[PDB]
Structure 1
Amino acid sequence: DEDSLKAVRLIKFLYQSNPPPNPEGTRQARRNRRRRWRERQRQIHSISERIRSTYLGRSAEP
């Protein structure tokens, strides 16, 4: 019943730790930062889904 609390907090915390990049520099840099941000967001997605499926609401799911 305590793993559930960590799980909800971790997920919360995961998304907050990935703010969008500040627009600055050349087109090439700005594109580079946005590509990396997107990669990180997807990673945060799969991680979260894994956590939800393990510790939370999706864990009851067949």
Structure 2
Amino acid sequence: GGSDEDALKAARAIKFLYQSNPPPNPEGTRQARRNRRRRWRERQRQIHSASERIASTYL
């Protein structure tokens, strides 16, 4: 509205009251912050080699 028009909105009467200034909570408890999900390039490589080898001593 203006430099003074806006100020009037904040307080029109000399009588001012002190109120608290808690954090935002549109849906109970939400945290709006900048974050990025990082990743990696490495996986585990196993092998299922459970063969069966006997001791063929003689023919």
RMSD (Å), alpha carbons: 33.9
Label 1:8 to 1:18 Cα distance change in 2 as closer, same or farther (>3 A).
same
Larger Rg over CA atoms: 2
Structure of greater relative contact order (alpha carbons < 8 Å, 6+ residues apart): 1
TM-score by length of structure 1 reads 0.14
Label 1:44 to 1:21 Cα distance change in 2 as closer, same or farther (>3 A).
farther
Runs of 4+ in 1 over 2 A off after TM superposition: 9-56
Q: Which has the higher helix share?
A: 1
Aligned length: 56
Identity, % of aligned positions: 91
TM-score by length of structure 2 reads 0.15
In structure 2, the gaps of 5 or more residues are none
